[PDB]
Amino acid sequence: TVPDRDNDGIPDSLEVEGYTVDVKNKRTFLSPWISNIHEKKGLTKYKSSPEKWSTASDPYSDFEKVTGRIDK
Amino acid sequence: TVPDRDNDGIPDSLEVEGYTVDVKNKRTFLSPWISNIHEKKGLTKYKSSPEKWSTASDPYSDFEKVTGRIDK
Amino acid sequence: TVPDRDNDGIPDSLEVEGYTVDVKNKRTFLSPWISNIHEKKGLTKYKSSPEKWSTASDPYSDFEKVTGRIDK
Amino acid sequence: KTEKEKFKDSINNLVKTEFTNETLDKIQQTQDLLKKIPKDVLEIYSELGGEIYFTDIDLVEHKELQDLSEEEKNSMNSRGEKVPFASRFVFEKKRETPKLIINIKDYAINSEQSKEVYYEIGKGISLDIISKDKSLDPEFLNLIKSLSDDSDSSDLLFSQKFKEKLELNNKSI
Amino acid sequence: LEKTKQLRLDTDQVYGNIATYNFENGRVRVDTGSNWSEVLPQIQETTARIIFNGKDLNLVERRIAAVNPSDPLETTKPDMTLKEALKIAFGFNEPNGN
Amino acid sequence: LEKTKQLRLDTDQVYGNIATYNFENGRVRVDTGSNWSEVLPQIQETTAR
Amino acid sequence: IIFNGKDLNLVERRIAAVNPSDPLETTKPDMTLKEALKIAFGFNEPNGN
Ligand SMILES: [Ca+2]
Ligand SMILES: [Ca+2]
Ligand SMILES: [Ca+2]
Ligand SMILES: [Ca+2]
Ligand SMILES: [Ca+2]
Ligand SMILES: [Ca+2]
Numbered sequence: 001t002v003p004d005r006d007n008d009g010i011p012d013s014l015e016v017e018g019y020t021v022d023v024k025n026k027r028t029f030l031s032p033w034i035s036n037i038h039e040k041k042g043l044t045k046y047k048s049s050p051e052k053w054s055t056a057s058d059p060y061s062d063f064e065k066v067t068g069r070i071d072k
Numbered sequence: 073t074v075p076d077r078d079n080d081g082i083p084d085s086l087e088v089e090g091y092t093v094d095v096k097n098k099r100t101f102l103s104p105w106i107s108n109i110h111e112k113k114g115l116t117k118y119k120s121s122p123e124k125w126s127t128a129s130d131p132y133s134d135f136e137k138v139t140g141r142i143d144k
Numbered sequence: 145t146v147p148d149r150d151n152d153g154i155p156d157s158l159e160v161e162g163y164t165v166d167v168k169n170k171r172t173f174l175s176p177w178i179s180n181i182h183e184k185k186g187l188t189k190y191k192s193s194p195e196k197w198s199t200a201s202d203p204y205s206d207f208e209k210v211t212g213r214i215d216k
Numbered sequence: 217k218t219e220k221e222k223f224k225d226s227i228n229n230l231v232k233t234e235f236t237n238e239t240l241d242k243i244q245q246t247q248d249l250l251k252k253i254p255k256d257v258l259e260i261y262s263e264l265g266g267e268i269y270f271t272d273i274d275l276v277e278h279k280e281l282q283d284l285s286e287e288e289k290n291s292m293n294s295r296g297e298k299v300p301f302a303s304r305f306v307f308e309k310k311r312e313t314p315k316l317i318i319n320i321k322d323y324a325i326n327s328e329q330s331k332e333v334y335y336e337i338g339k340g341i342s343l344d345i346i347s348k349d350k351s352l353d354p355e356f357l358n359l360i361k362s363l364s365d366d367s368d369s370s371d372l373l374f375s376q377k378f379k380e381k382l383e384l385n386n387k388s389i
Numbered sequence: 390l391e392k393t394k395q396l397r398l399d400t401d402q403v404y405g406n407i408a409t410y411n412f413e414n415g416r417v418r419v420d421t422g423s424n425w426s427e428v429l430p431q432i433q434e435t436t437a438r439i440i441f442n443g444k445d446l447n448l449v450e451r452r453i454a455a456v457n458p459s460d461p462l463e464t465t466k467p468d469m470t471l472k473e474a475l476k477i478a479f480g481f482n483e484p485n486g487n
Numbered sequence: 488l489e490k491t492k493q494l495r496l497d498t499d500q501v502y503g504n505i506a507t508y509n510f511e512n513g514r515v516r517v518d519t520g521s522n523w524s525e526v527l528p529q530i531q532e533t534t535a536r
Numbered sequence: 537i538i539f540n541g542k543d544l545n546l547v548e549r550r551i552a553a554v555n556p557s558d559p560l561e562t563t564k565p566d567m568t569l570k571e572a573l574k575i576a577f578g579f580n581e582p583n584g585n
Contacts, residue, residue, distance in 0.1 A: 051462060054513060057435050070410060112371070122170055128530065175231075
């Protein structure tokens with residue numbers, strides 16, 4: 001099982017190196033950054049801290065912020 | 073396992089003889105004091121008591137005070 | 145195991161026949177009273193009640209009283 | 217329910233029910249120190265003639281460390297420095313056959329004295345595993361090269377003289 | 390008060406709750422135990438502040454998570470430049486390189 | 488008080504809470520069941536000032 | 537959508553539509569104005585209008 005220290009639902013390697021969020025058919029996929037694919041699709045590249053549940057110390061996760069599972 | 077009497081997260085021999093906290097990529101690791109590695113980087117050398125959860129009897133454990141997992 | 149009727153954490157033979165508390169490197173040790181070792185070190189010989197959780201009927205156990213794990 | 221046995225496990229090491237011997241606890245602590253290394257290491261040591269002794273005589277009045285060469289009297293300890301022979305507590309005499317002498321101490325609550333024993337044990341079985349063919353094994357040489365490429369590994373493992381001579385010869389090997 | 394007509398109103402503090410996402414049914418629920426006074430002093434100590442009035446000449450305040458070099462947990466955040474902070478905070482861009 | 492104009496303000500004690508770290512989500516939560524008067528006499532007896 | 541073609545009274549409905557810059561709302565089905573008027577208020581088309 002993949003390591004995830006802060007328990008924010010996103011692994012530590014992706015937080016240190018870079019990730020993005022991408023709906024594909026009607027389902028949301030969280031995926032590592034690939035320069036050949038996600039650049040031309042207009043996708044933003046996120047980095048965050050693998051040991052903080054909320055990198056800005058506000059009460060919303062990194063996962064909820066990048067995904068949309070947040071107070072609208 | 074390794075003993076931990078006061079249940080704060082630092083083992084007893086590290087609390088008695090010396091420890092420090094280093095950050096290697098984006099992950100912090102609580103390591104014992106090595107005077108070759110940790111003295112070139114200017115790290116601090118801590119000692120505390122192996123049987124008090126908080127050595128100064130304040131409501132913050134030794135692990136939170138050294139690793140930054142504290143009220144800011 | 146060992147019998148401990150009063151549930152204070154110190155066995156009944158030690159409470160009837162004597163015990164003492166010493167610190168060795170930085171760790172405390174509750175041990176029975178040997179009259180050759182502990183006599184010359186100025187240690188105190190304690191006795192208690194194996195049936196009472198606190199022999200003086202106050203809200204601090206015998207273990208907490210002799211060990212220092214008490215309201216300061 | 218589980219809180220009461222949680223309390224009984226948080227004082228499981230504190231209370232000692234039967235003691236009655238001060239120099240007998242050091243024997244048990246040396247024994248369960250030495251049983252932490254795996255048995256194959258001890259078989260490897262006893263194969264080329266390894267003896268391990270538990271004494272309580274400190275290692276100046278010991279009879280089998282009584283007269284010996286002076287350069288063997290000051291070898292590298294776990295740091296890399298040297299130490300007076302009046303303050304050592306471990307030694308591996310290896311003149312005709314390797315002989316390990318361990319003074320009994322409270323090794324269960326002293327993890328710095330507990331590391332020099334492991335360093336001398338690894339000193340004993342070193343040349344068996346490093347040099348399988350009366351020369352350094354090439355897997356270990358690739359390891360030495362890949363550790364010298366890094367810096368944290370270099371100042372952890374290598375001594376200072378080996379570190380400066382590893383770049384004086386520019387990894388000549 | 391009838392002579393000098395000077396009377397103003399200060400704001401010392403503001404109480405208020407937080408509403409978080411419940412993962413089971415997706416609903417957003419207000420936790421009436423937690424308030425925003427335990428949170429904003431953690432935002433104000435780990436973030437850099439940029440105030441900006443290039444839009445309608447109104448002061449717009451944002452905060453961007455930057456690294457404090459003398460804290461082990463805070464040196465795990467990603468490195469923040471001033472240019473990337475201006476890009477992701479307000480909406481600056483480089484349509485030609487500038 | 489109109490004659491001598493002496494009125495001061497003593498401070499007998501202070502009530503206030505403690506906010507502790509929460510390991511599961513990193514947040515910092517004020518426990519309203521524990522105040523500083525249980526803590527601060529333990530600091531006063533084991534420390535040097 | 538606000539509509540008063542029945543008894544000239546303002547009747548307000550809301551129909552779930554896609555936000556294109558938020559990944560949770562790009563999962564909702566595609567809503568057209570004809571289908572919004574058909575399912576919200578009671579429009580139909582008995583012969584093609
Ligand atoms: Ca995170
Ligand atoms: Ca994570
Ligand atoms: Ca500890
Ligand atoms: Ca401690
Ligand atoms: Ca008892
Ligand atoms: Ca008792």
